[PDB]
Specification:
The structure is a homotetramer. Chain A is α/β, with parallel strands linked by helices and 255 residues long. Chain A contains 7 helices and 7 strands. Chain A is globular and about 50 Å long. At the A-C interface, α6 of A face α6 of C. Bound molecules: nicotinamide-adenine-dinucleotide (NAD) (4 copies), ligand 9G4 (4 copies) and magnesium ion (2 copies). One nicotinamide-adenine-dinucleotide (NAD) binds next to α1 and β5 of chain C. The site of one nicotinamide-adenine-dinucleotide has 24 residues of chain C, from α1 and β5.
Chain lengths: 255, 252, 259, 256
């Protein structure tokens, strides 16, 4: 008797057992969801990781920059869940920005690197929704991972720009998803240890737990995974094109 | 096997069976919560309304402008739930603005005594209720208030919109205090619910909402409040969850 | 000058460190003809306004006094001359008792104190606009002083709530002011100095100030009201003609940076 | 004049209806000395309509060689020993697959990427190239529109503006090191073939704007926008950076 009992949910973005998507997948399975997982590039390695989840789940290859992968995705998911069955949820937990656009001066990132980062981190949220909406049930839910990019910060540079673009994409995806009776939302998380940039990240994370009224544990992805599962559930049925902040309330406090 | 099984939750704001608080109370009981209800002034009238709920719940008097009611509130709740027991949730679904400050009356013609009363009941009372009830709340607890998006001005709602802007700010400070108790504080910003300026506001809502908006149905709002009362949004505080069909995310 | 020939009312001078004193000074240097309003200590205020570069009539205005508001337009008209109207209005008024802003716990502020603070700090922006819009020229401008209340912070407590209410009042005043061809905007300033709190609150406030200069990409000088006064004068001018119901941030860009 | 003696670079003139043409005109009326940049294949015939002579330099923001030589070419135009006091970015582009009648999901990434390169990334490119030749107290201004809420038709151009707002906040961090401000002006729609359906959607967007704006909005008039940009280029908003000034008649502050 789980929060997601009988729901068929696709979860992308597992690379390690520290990945936010690994925790989202774990909590969803504990809550009765039947999963379909998608992995990028290191498929043999991802299968070794996903074996650590509480239940077996089919693993499909998905490189969001690969148009052929996107074109075959719905068909491959239908084969995995059975003809006549559709998805109730989709989790986008994919992000990438080359080291020139993260960590290196903001002005020194070449556009080919920024473009690749925006493709994977923002445009792919629209790509995945385009591919999967035709195989989603009414009352369904699409959830993506974000971080608050409303204010600039050290080091995250072009990845912050990519998140600003992702929040805008999310609002357009909601217009399309609504036609199917599906919601589209992002979860803006606090910093999670998933694996002078070092001094910047340290100062960011320190200021986090201090600014958060309920505190913030950077080593624990469970509160974020639970928030994603709340959006996948039937309990936020009138929320779409929106952002839910799972950050300990830090974005609501100046100091 | 409900979302709020074994949770003790206080729900204020029931006046009719169309009140948002009535639907929040109904959904919370369906989800296994044990409720304590608070009402204002017409307690006999409110008691008859609460008989329509699926389960019996004690009804306590609470006029948020009455300091004596606030001073005795925790003691009265403790008598209702039993000594040694604490609340897991609190729902503030209280609002009021006199006709001079909300409606057809020019924005400039509302006297301050009316605006002040409206702000007292609609915004300051969210702090008053948290002050009174935080000493009797469990860690992991949740305080939820009802709001509407006041980030842009609109016809008619005038000073009530100002009171909601003040309420959003109050919620952010209540979160700082509530965090000391391991308690979250959040608001649910709802679309218009039936509980021709208002008709035009509603039409534009269902049009802007990507998933549409049914003004006659408080259930999606009640479900959202229950999601915040649950253990499923444990890292959200001082925040606003929009149960408005996504209308605030679309220009047109 | 930027404000050559403009008739502008400026409220909120109490000392020569008041933001309104600097706004009045910059406005006069820019050719504006002022009318000043003061509260309670009129003899004291008169001595302060003698430190401004030009003489300006001083009118009494307690924003909690309805008789003062009812007679304001008539008293301004007598000061500027019959047939003349105001081109600008500056609201630089704020008040919150020590129970609502300072060391006192957020929960311990009684409503009579919060209500007085909201009356003076937020509601009076609407009161002043109601009183003065009938004597304002098309192309006119109303400007109020604010601080960013979108996130909670230590100590400012109910004054932060009052500023959240003021931002909302500003959006409604813009709807009314537009009927007269008049703009309404707020300037959100960084902290300006315009042991007493004890070691604990004193350290919290010091961190708030230091953090501001650190976050501001162009820095922030807490001793200097001039960049704020210049911003208010930009809004009083004809150079932001399509901005209304809005907030302009004169804070060194601090609100645009997380750290 | 508001900009007496200031040396200001203005990019983005293509026609005499371009917002940059009006910004350039108002800047010259206010005493500025301009350097203009353009990219097309005869902009000089258009820039000749301005009240004063101004050197015109070629700048394709997707061209790394043009960006690498820009500061040197500007220095040659304004004279050795002189620096810029202002920079105006009034450049935007989104192919018809990403903005217009095309479904949001049907825009291919190569088209969106080109749109983002020109409309958002180039704001950082121009600041990188010109900050080394800017005076303290200088100002960089870019053109934007409010992308906080989704809307019909503008689709990927709205996404590009969301990215541009974020870029501006990072440019402000870099510009601050030089004592230079970086801000955007978010304008309402300006009139600078779609069919009945999209034509009606755009008409509703326009009508809605003038009705929401407490002071109204004249879509045929770029002058209020040009004036706002000149206010940011001036010394009168000295403590504003990484920010957005709305020259939209106050429409963004009103729901209805
Ligand atoms: N870790 C945090 O602090 C944090 C905070 C907020 C948001 N987020 C976001 O959460 C998401 C997941 O991050 P994480 O911390 O779990 O890191 P992670 O490295 O474990 O996950 C990123 C995932 O993106 C995948 N990916 C990269 N390129 C891809 C491509 N072309 N096609 C498909 N998948 C691709 C990787 O394989 C990986 O599984 C990201 O969007 C990230 O920005 C993370
Ligand atoms: N109805 C909507 O469209 C809508 C939309 C968004 C938010 N809200 C908010 O939700 C809340 C509930 O509103 P509703 O629509 O259920 O209307 P309602 O009239 O049914 O409920 C308002 C409640 O406030 C109570 N109240 C008034 N004065 C009080 C006092 N002195 N002490 C204690 N309680 C007092 C009333 O008794 C009543 O129960 C309000 O804050 C309202 O602003 C309503
Ligand atoms: N750091 C700062 O100082 C700071 C930052 C941002 C915004 N502001 C705001 O700027 C404004 C002016 O503040 P200041 O720093 O110049 O302080 P101040 O103490 O010099 O000015 C406040 C003014 O309000 C007046 N006032 C109070 N009660 C009044 C009443 N009933 N009727 C009429 N006037 C009344 C006072 O007489 C005084 O002139 C306030 O709104 C304040 O919140 C200040
Ligand atoms: N017109 C409006 O309603 C409106 C509203 C808000 C904001 N804006 C923005 O204002 C800016 C100017 O637009 P406009 O309406 O004046 O239209 P425009 O077509 O006159 O200006 C766009 C300019 O971008 C230039 N450009 C395109 N690709 C370029 C490249 N590779 N290198 C250099 N320059 C390049 C074009 O040559 C042209 O000068 C754009 O950023 C636009 O999004 C326009
Ligand atoms: C190479 C690459 O791009 N890897 C994927 C990846 C990219 C970025 C992140 N990421 N990390 C962190 C972090 N913990 O430092 C991160 O922390 C935050 C940064 C800023 C905010 Cl506001 C909140 C959290 C965000 C984020 O997206 C996580 C994984
Ligand atoms: C007289 C009085 O104050 N009664 C209590 C009360 C006060 C205000 C509301 N209220 N009603 C409505 C409505 N549907 O008309 C209302 O609708 C909205 C108004 C604006 C927005 Cl942004 C969203 C919803 C808000 C609100 O608070 C409901 C009840
Ligand atoms: C007793 C009283 O109400 N006096 C009037 C008055 C009230 C408040 C302020 N005020 N002071 C300060 C300060 N300490 O620098 C102040 O600093 C800031 C606080 C927060 C922010 Cl976000 C920005 C600035 C704000 C403010 O309104 C100034 C004057
Ligand atoms: C072909 C091409 O990309 N030309 C450059 C260009 C790109 C976009 C625009 N542009 N046009 C308009 C318009 N008036 O239709 C425009 O209108 C608005 C759209 C949305 C908002 Cl919120 C405000 C204004 C924005 C914009 O950027 C103008 C020029
Ligand atoms: Mg700094
Ligand atoms: Mg209008």
């Amino acid at each position: 008797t789980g929060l997601l009992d009988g729901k068929r949910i696709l979860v992308s973005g597992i690379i390690t057992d520290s990945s936010i998507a690994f925790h989202i997948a774990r909590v969803a399975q504990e809550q009765g969801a039947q999963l379909v997982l998608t992995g990028f590039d290191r498929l043999r390695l991802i299968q070794r990781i996903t074996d650590r989840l509480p239940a077996k789940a089919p693993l499909l290859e998905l490189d969001v920059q690969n148009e052929e992968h996107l074109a075959s995705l719905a068909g491959r998911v239908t084969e995995a869940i059975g003809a006549g069955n559709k998805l109730d949820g989709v989790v986008h937990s994919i992000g990438f920005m080359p080291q020139t656009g993260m960590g290196n001066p903001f002005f020194d990132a070449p556009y080919a690197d920024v473009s690749k980062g925006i493709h994977i981190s923002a445009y792919s949220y629209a790509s995945m929704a385009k591919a999967l909406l035709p195989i989603m049930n009414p009352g369904g839910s699409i959830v993506g991972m974000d971080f608050d990019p409303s204010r600039a910060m050290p080091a995250y540079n072009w990845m912050t720009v990519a998140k600003s673009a992702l929040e805008s994409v999310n609002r357009f995806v909601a217009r399309e998803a609504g036609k199917y009776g599906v919601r589209s939302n992002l979860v803006a998380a606090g910093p999670i240890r998933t694996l002078e940039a070092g001094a910047q990240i340290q100062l960011l994370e320190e200021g986090w737990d201090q600014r958060a009224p309920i505190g913030w544990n950077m080593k624990d992805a469970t509160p974020v995974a639970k928030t994603v599962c709340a959006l996948l559930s039937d309990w936020l049925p009138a929320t779409t094109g929106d952002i839910i902040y799972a950050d300990g309330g830090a974005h609501t406090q100046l100091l």
